[PDB]
Amino acid sequence: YKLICYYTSWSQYREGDGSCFPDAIDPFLCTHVIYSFANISNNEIDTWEWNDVTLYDTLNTLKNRNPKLKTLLSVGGWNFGSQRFSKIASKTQSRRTFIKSVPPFLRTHGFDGLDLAWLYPGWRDKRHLTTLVKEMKAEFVREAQAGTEQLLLSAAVPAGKIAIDRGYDIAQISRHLDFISLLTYDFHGAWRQTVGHHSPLFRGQEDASSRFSNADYAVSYMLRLGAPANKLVMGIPTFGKSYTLASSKTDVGAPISGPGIPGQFTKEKGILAYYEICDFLHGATTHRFRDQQVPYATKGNQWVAYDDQESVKNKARYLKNRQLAGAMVWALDLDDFRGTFCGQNLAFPLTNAIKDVLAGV
């Protein structure tokens, strides 16, 4: 099994216990650690944070302890406009400039591969993503001639049917990618005007236009489009999503006024880290969606959809039953990486829960 774990470069800026540098990572936890995100400047891959060169080195020194650990660098992400990637991918010259820049930058910085995180291609971009993936792979195949183990190529793909169909030729790109991380944790958000879970495994039995808004629908869909099970990796979040309730109602369909209040450490409305959620659960009311197989909690006017040890184990069992390639975690810095917040004295409780299932059976 693969256990693909993202680390985000902006987590370093969080206050006090929220600050996470790559030497916080247990080297034997994940099989692959992906640093998010690189820029594209001068149509070449490049650093984003001022100190990225140092943080790359800190990450890549984990391989002193575990020489089998694979690292990748993710290019793109949501602070990179889709329209920027489009411009690069859609022209022969800029695409070649970009492609050629990748392997030397990866080798300089000690990475084993590239993750493409174009978030997200429009309908005019589908064919250009295909070309990008094929040509990038062929550049990696050429570069392996020089004697170092071929660089890996992955991509992060959204899990909504509409986004998939719009932007991705799954049958084609799956040929050239080493794995696809399916982002099975964005099925609900505050644009909905009601509470709801963003990472359910299955449909809620109560309401149903969108039988597509769940992990199982998306996994099935990808396999049906021709993504091989042995290249497909299912996304599992360590964060939760928060909402401000508009009324005293908390159950299916409860109305909301907006996203939840920022977390003390992550400081972004509508999201909480797992460590923040463990604190949140003191004084909260806990509920599980029985059919969706995920939990939610509420206190005051706040309502949080999240994943816990049980729900992530349940997802790991699912993907193993489907003979997928493994799990992807978004993100290490959003798990209880200190291990001091969730009553367990155990660093990375969610990631470790997953790992233990995958290793078993």
Ligand X SMILES: *[C@@H]1O[C@H](CO)[C@@H](O)[C@H](O)[C@H]1NC(C)=O
The annotation places the binding site for chitin at 49-50, 76-79, 120, 183-186, 241, 330
111 lines the binding site for ligand X (CB under 6 A): no
Out of 9, 11, 39, 242, the only residue in the binding site for ligand X (CB under 6 A) is 39
Please state the φ and ψ torsions of residue 357, each to the nearest 5 degrees.
Answer: -65, -50
Output the residue with the shortest Cβ distance to ligand X.
Answer: 41
DSSP state for residue 65 in the 8-state scheme: T
Q: b vs e for 338-360, b when ≥16 Cβ sit within 10 Å of the residue's Cβ?
A: eeebbeeeebbbbbbbbbebbee
Q: Count of H helices and E strands in the chain?
A: 10, 15
- Whichever of 85 and 280 has its CB closer to ligand X, that residue is 85
In the complex with ligand X, the residue whose CB is nearer, 48 or 275, is 48
Residue labelled with tokens 């001091």: 340
Does the protein bind ligand X through residue 51 (CB under 6 A)? no
**Does 48 help bind ligand X (rule: CB under 6 A)?**
yes
Residue 341 contacts ligand X per CB under 6 A: no
Nearest to 249 by CA among 198, 193, 292: 193
CA distances to 195, 228, 241 from 189, in Å: 8, 29, 8
- In angstroms, the CA 228 to CA 244 distance is 40
Q: Which is nearer to ligand X, 41 or 257 (CB)?
A: 41
Cβ(36)–Cβ(79) below 8 Å: no
User: Does 41 help bind ligand X (rule: CB under 6 A)?
Assistant: yes
Q: State the nearest-atom distance from the C-beta of 40 to ligand X, in Å.
A: 6
Scan residues 310-339 and list those touching ligand X (CB under 6 A).
none
- Cβ of residue 51: shortest distance to ligand X, in angstroms? 12
Q: Which is nearer to ligand X, 84 or 166 (CB)?
A: 84
Q: Which is nearer to ligand X, 39 or 292 (CB)?
A: 39
Residues of the shown chain interacting with ligand X in the complex, contacts defined by CB under 6 A: 39, 41, 48
